[PDB]
Design an enzyme around this catalytic site. Structure first.
Site, PDB file in Angstrom:
ATOM      1  N   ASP A 130     -26.702  19.498 108.043  1.00 32.31           N
ATOM      2  CA  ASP A 130     -26.741  19.607 106.724  1.00 32.31           C
ATOM      3  C   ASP A 130     -27.125  20.454 105.163  1.00 32.31           C
ATOM      4  O   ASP A 130     -28.254  20.419 104.685  1.00 32.31           O
ATOM      5  CB  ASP A 130     -28.038  18.106 106.327  1.00 32.31           C
ATOM      6  CG  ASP A 130     -27.569  17.328 105.428  1.00 32.31           C
ATOM      7  OD1 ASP A 130     -26.503  17.086 104.893  1.00 32.31           O
ATOM      8  OD2 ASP A 130     -28.290  16.388 104.727  1.00 32.31           O
ATOM      9  N   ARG A 134     -29.454  20.810  98.282  1.00 30.67           N
ATOM     10  CA  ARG A 134     -30.739  19.666  98.478  1.00 30.67           C
ATOM     11  C   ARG A 134     -31.795  20.551  98.950  1.00 30.67           C
ATOM     12  O   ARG A 134     -33.001  19.506  98.748  1.00 30.67           O
ATOM     13  CB  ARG A 134     -29.834  19.131  97.942  1.00 30.67           C
ATOM     14  CG  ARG A 134     -29.160  18.775  99.324  1.00 30.67           C
ATOM     15  CD  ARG A 134     -28.207  17.112  98.952  1.00 30.67           C
ATOM     16  NE  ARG A 134     -28.002  16.850 100.298  1.00 30.67           N
ATOM     17  CZ  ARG A 134     -26.049  17.245 100.205  1.00 30.67           C
ATOM     18  NH1 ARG A 134     -25.486  17.937  99.127  1.00 30.67           N
ATOM     19  NH2 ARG A 134     -25.567  16.466 101.434  1.00 30.67           N
TER      20      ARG A 134
HETATM   21  N1  LIG Z   1     -39.207  15.458 107.066  1.00 32.93           N
HETATM   22  C1  LIG Z   1     -37.572  14.862 107.190  1.00 32.93           C
HETATM   23  C2  LIG Z   1     -36.927  16.098 106.042  1.00 32.93           C
HETATM   24  C3  LIG Z   1     -37.703  16.518 104.992  1.00 32.93           C
HETATM   25  C4  LIG Z   1     -37.234  17.431 103.764  1.00 32.93           C
HETATM   26  C5  LIG Z   1     -37.935  18.349 102.735  1.00 32.93           C
HETATM   27  O1  LIG Z   1     -37.446  18.562 102.260  1.00 32.93           O
HETATM   28  C6  LIG Z   1     -35.570  19.064 102.220  1.00 32.93           C
HETATM   29  C7  LIG Z   1     -39.278  18.163 102.862  1.00 32.93           C
HETATM   30  C8  LIG Z   1     -39.566  18.970 102.317  1.00 32.93           C
HETATM   31  C9  LIG Z   1     -39.515  18.424 100.513  1.00 32.93           C
HETATM   32  C10 LIG Z   1     -40.574  19.685  99.721  1.00 32.93           C
HETATM   33  C11 LIG Z   1     -41.375  20.324  99.871  1.00 32.93           C
HETATM   34  C12 LIG Z   1     -41.216  20.558 101.322  1.00 32.93           C
HETATM   35  C13 LIG Z   1     -41.346  20.070 102.638  1.00 32.93           C
HETATM   36  N2  LIG Z   1     -41.768  20.922  98.587  1.00 32.93           N
HETATM   37  C14 LIG Z   1     -41.461  20.435  98.136  1.00 32.93           C
HETATM   38  N3  LIG Z   1     -42.530  21.302  96.402  1.00 32.93           N
HETATM   39  C15 LIG Z   1     -41.909  20.296  95.124  1.00 32.93           C
HETATM   40  O2  LIG Z   1     -41.301  19.375  94.911  1.00 32.93           O
HETATM   41  N4  LIG Z   1     -42.711  21.052  93.975  1.00 32.93           N
HETATM   42  C16 LIG Z   1     -42.312  20.646  92.463  1.00 32.93           C
HETATM   43  C17 LIG Z   1     -42.976  19.599  92.478  1.00 32.93           C
HETATM   44  O3  LIG Z   1     -44.512  19.252  93.099  1.00 32.93           O
HETATM   45  S1  LIG Z   1     -40.319  19.194  98.204  1.00 32.93           S
HETATM   46  C18 LIG Z   1     -40.185  17.669 104.012  1.00 32.93           C
HETATM   47  C19 LIG Z   1     -38.914  16.900 104.801  1.00 32.93           C
HETATM   48  C20 LIG Z   1     -39.831  16.176 106.222  1.00 32.93           C
END
Ligand SMILES: *N1=[C][C]=C2[C]=C(O[C])C(C3=[C]C4=C([C]=[C]3)N=C([N]C(=O)[N][C][C]=O)S4)=[C]C2=[C]1
Length: 267
Positions: A130, A134
């Site tokens: 995948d 995104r």
């Molecule tokens: N388990 C299964 C699938 C996951 C997918 C995924 O993202 C593809 C995460 C994940 C998402 C985000 C992370 C870290 C891991 N950090 C983020 N920061 C963010 O959004 N900053 C803007 C506002 O705060 S988003 C985890 C998964 C876990």
């Protein structure tokens, strides 16, 4: 296993990340270190699948792969704790960025990072299945990490066959996967090509306007996405190389990373 285990009360949960786009992932605080973390919690997916996701990630160590920090797998609800990324996914990042800052050499740097992570996974006999903007995440200073939560073990010369009735992100999906549900590291190479196109267009949707049910038919007749606006011809040739019909003709990630390394060092 045991070294990764931690108590649930070490973490304080905040609000959900991404509005549910990443699933049941919450922003959390690792109190002991006052560190913001990402917590995957478990309806949803199956328990043993969830547990296997955690098991695989503790085998993974790469600067451009999202790092596992700990797990809570002794008493429900189960937690998977990973590092928190500052900006979120690469797609929204590219769409909303300042392109004078995020310019041509930054794009190259991002591709080098992503290809570096995939070169690692290729060597470790994993597949992603995948790969897309995104599912890439962005930290400060244009740091990019590939999300590695759905990795599958697969030997280099072997093929993964997806379960019957599986739904694919069609416009990122390799033709052998669309037609026969077959996945391999060469299938990730195809997806990488589309990921490159996403980056070069700063987050445009692939095959814009094209009906999803005709995508495979177009691919059969050797239709491919046009060279993006302002995209270097050398970069576009890498994209076209990734989109070769025969998966064995597609470049390895080792070659892809080397090519991007060279370009990034020469600009
Ligand atoms: N388990 C299964 C699938 C996951 C997918 C995924 O993202 C593809 C995460 C994940 C998402 C985000 C992370 C870290 C891991 N950090 C983020 N920061 C963010 O959004 N900053 C803007 C506002 O705060 S988003 C985890 C998964 C876990």
């Amino acid at each position: 296993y045991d070294k990764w285990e931690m108590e649930r009360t070490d973490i304080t949960m905040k609000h959900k990340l991404g509005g549910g786009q990443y699933g049941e992932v919450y922003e959390g605080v690792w109190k002991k270190y006052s560190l913001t973390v990402a917590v995957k919690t478990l309806d949803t997916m199956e328990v043993e699948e969830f547990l296997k996701e955690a098991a695989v990630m503790k085998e993974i160590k790469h600067p451009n792969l999202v790092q596992l920090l700990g797990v809570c797998t002794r008493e429900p609800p189960f937690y998977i704790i990973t590092e928190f990324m500052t900006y979120g996914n690469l797609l929204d990042y590219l769409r909303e960025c300042n392109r004078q800052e995020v310019n041509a050499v930054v794009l190259l740097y991002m591709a080098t990072q992503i290809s570096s992570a995939m070169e690692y996974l290729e060597k470790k006999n994993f597949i992603h299945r995948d790969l897309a903007a995104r599912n890439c995440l962005v930290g400060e200073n244009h740091l990019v990490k590939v999300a590695d939560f759905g990795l599958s073990r697969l030997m280099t010369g072997d093929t993964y066959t997806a379960h019957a009735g599986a739904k694919f992100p069609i416009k990122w999906t390799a033709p052998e996967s669309l037609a026969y549900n077959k996945f391999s590291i060469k299938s990730d190479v195809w997806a990488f090509g589309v990921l490159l196109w996403e980056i070069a267009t700063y987050g445009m949707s692939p095959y814009p306007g094209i009906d999803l049910s005709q995508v495979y038919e177009l691919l059969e007749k050797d239709y491919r996405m046009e060279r993006p606006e302002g995209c270097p011809e050398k970069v576009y040739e890498l994209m076209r190389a990734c989109w070769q019909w025969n998966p064995s003709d597609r470049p390895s990630f080792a070659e892809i990373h080397q090519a991007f390394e060279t370009m990034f060092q020469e600009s």
